[PDB]
Amino acid sequence: KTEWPELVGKSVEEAKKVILQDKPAAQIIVLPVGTIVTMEYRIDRVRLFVDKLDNIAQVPRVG
Template identity: 55%
Template structure:
């Protein structure tokens, strides 16, 4: 709450960390949605069976796609 009992903006509480709604979309459609929600995101499209580093990066969102360029699992920050 802010001073005077007025609720603080809900922006921080509503910050997204995953995008399950893009599963099944093309990589370009998924990237567009993710950037709408998190403009500073470094969106990386990766084949679903690829090895990736396990380091955590708050600006990175990996989008795993199949051979038809469809998102296979919910992208998330990391």
């Protein structure tokens, strides 16, 4: 499992719980949606982009 479309709209706490169950060594970082990010590829990382309600705004994916 590398993508989580079912988590769009969930809170950060809810999303982290599911991702860690599916990918125990996931390196999760939370950022505002609409930002620019570094383009290195990290297979263990999962960025969570959040909206103004602090909910997952985009499909989480490894990288």
